[PDB]
Amino acid sequence: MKIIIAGKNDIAVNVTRWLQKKKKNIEIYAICNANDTGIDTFQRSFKKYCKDNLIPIISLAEAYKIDDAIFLSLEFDKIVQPSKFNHNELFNIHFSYLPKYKGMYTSAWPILNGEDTSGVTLHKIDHGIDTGAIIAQKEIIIQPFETAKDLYEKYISEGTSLVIDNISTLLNSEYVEKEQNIKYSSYYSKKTIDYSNLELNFSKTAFEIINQLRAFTFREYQLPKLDGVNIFLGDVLSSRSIMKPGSILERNDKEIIVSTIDYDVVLYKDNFKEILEACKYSDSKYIAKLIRAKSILFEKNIYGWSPVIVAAYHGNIELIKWLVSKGANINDRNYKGTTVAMYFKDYMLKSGDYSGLKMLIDLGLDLTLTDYKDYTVFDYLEKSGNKNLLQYMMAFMK
């Protein structure tokens, strides 16, 4: 049978990849979003993927004319008109637990509002915005540390899983739907946040303010700013200044302390670039000092280089171990899919120091992984003619 996948980012890519794997009998057509540049960024380009995999890319107007297909929307950017199809097998993943948080910026609004939870919802496309009947959902816990970016990445992951768990019933017409309730229904348009003019509001509680920081913390788009200085999270003090809300109590190199309606807050200056530079050659002890919010250790620059990737490229094995102890992914990837192991290989090759591989492997380092060109570390070693190092690396795999 046939499926049209309409949308973007790792959710479209990964739903597609699964289909090519487990449903090879299925003709796939793609619709891409107007702003998919064709180049991989912090999310994969769906357009790139479809080109690289000979998946035909069509228009929505063309998709309307395909019979005996289902249609599946995944962060799609176009209004879909149900009457224009010759069927009603029209499905969307929305990044909320409907009926709450219809519309936009669902990575921010639940955080701003102090929600503990959100979700992803599979539903029918009807004539309105995220109004159609619910087929499946999955609740997501928002952790107190988590940013809008963390929550978006959870949406992407949980949304992928929910499709995968339901896509057979979508293909079989063996699914059940239920109309959305009136009660609790909520919606935010794009007018509700003006990302070109964000401003922290300190006439609020400390809880609210920290939730502002979190909601606006999505590095590839922006960081919250106080007085032009970029902030990466904050914490609540027990202190309660009688200075009017917004008054800056202290300023140092690492932080700004501000008066609120209730408890003082400390806003950490974003020092990610500096942290990343230190990852080349410093140890544990130095990095632990630079750090304020722990999750800053999992951020990435514009190439997708994290702390643990930089450490790997420079053979900083003591730091790699500490980072992984803190939550870092031993198999982290840049935006081309290049893995920690590949970067470590570069170090081994340069230094002639092979000795640290065993320890990384015991931390979970995976030599089988492929980048987005379908190459393993061994592909690169074969190409560069480094057969002895290739054999050496294979000898430690388990």
* Distance between start and end Cα atoms, the chain: 40
Answer yes or no whether residue 303 interacts with ligand TYD by CB under 6 A: yes
Q: Which helix (H) or strand (E) holds 189?
A: none
Q: Find the angle CA(188)-CA(43)-CA(186) to the nearest 5 degrees.
A: 15
Strand pairing category for 90-94 and 117-124: antiparallel
Beta carbons of 257 and 248 less than 8 angstroms apart = yes
Least distance from a copy of itself to the Cβ atom of residue 89, Å: 20
Within 105-144, the residues that bind ligand TYD by CB under 6 A are 105-108
Answer for which of 36, 75, 146, 264 binds ligand TYD (CB under 6 A) is 75
For a copy of itself, the closer of residues 264 and 332 by Cβ is 264
| Strand ranges of the sheet holding 255-258, from the earlier edge strand across to the other edge | 225-226, 229-236, 265-269, 255-258, 248-251
Answer yes or no whether residue 152 interacts with ligand TYD by CB under 6 A: yes
18 annotated as a binding-site residue: no
Return residues touching a copy of itself (CB under 8 A): 99, 102-103, 114, 126-129, 131, 180, 182-187, 189, 191, 203-208, 236, 240, 242, 261-263
Beta carbons of 103 and 191 less than 8 angstroms apart = no
Can you point out the beta strands (E) in 227-326?
A: 229-236, 248-251, 255-258, 265-269
How far apart (Å, rounded) are the C-alpha atoms in residues 112 and 107?
9
Answer for which of 33, 180, 217, 259 binds Na ion (CB under 5 A) is 259
Within 227-256, the residues that bind Na ion by CB under 5 A are 241
Residue 203 binding partner per list a copy of itself, ligand TYD, Na ion, none, with a CB distance cut-off of 5 to 8 Å that depends on partner kind: a copy of itself
Answer yes or no whether residue 310 interacts with ligand TYD by CB under 6 A: yes
Q: Which residues are annotated as a binding site?
A: 8, 43, 107, 152, 195, 221-222, 305, 313, 334, 338, 343
Applying CB under 6 A, the residues found at the interface with ligand TYD are 9, 75, 105-108, 148, 152, 195, 218, 221-222, 303, 305, 309-310, 313, 334, 336, 338, 343
Which parts of this chain interact with Na ion (CB under 5 A)? Answer: 86, 190, 193, 241, 259
